[PDB]
């Protein structure tokens, strides 16, 4: 259905695009 897809997509990519930008940092320590 509509809306839900946008919502699940809102959490998608972003959660990683932002986490990758952070994970890439913690990767120096870990």
The amount of beta strand, in percent, is under 5%
Give helix % range: over 70%
What is the overall silhouette?
Answer: rod-shaped
Biggest pleated sheet: none
Radius of gyration: 13 Å
Number of helices: 2
Succession of helices and strands: HH
- Alpha-beta classification: mainly alpha
Q: Terminal Cα separation, in Å?
A: 40 Å
Number of strands: 0
Write a concise keyword list for the protein shown above.
about 30 residues, mainly alpha, 2 helices, about 80% helix, rod-shaped
Provide structural commentary:
The PDB classes it as neuropeptide. The structure is a monomer. The chain has helices at residues 4-11, 14-29. With 30 residues, it is mainly alpha-helical. Helix content is 80%, strand content 0%. It starts with a helix and ends with a helix.
């Amino acid at each position: 259905x509509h809306l839900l897809r946008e919502v699940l997509e809102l959490a998608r990519a972003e959660q990683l695009a932002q986490e990758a930008h952070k994970n890439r940092k913690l990767l120096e320590i870990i």
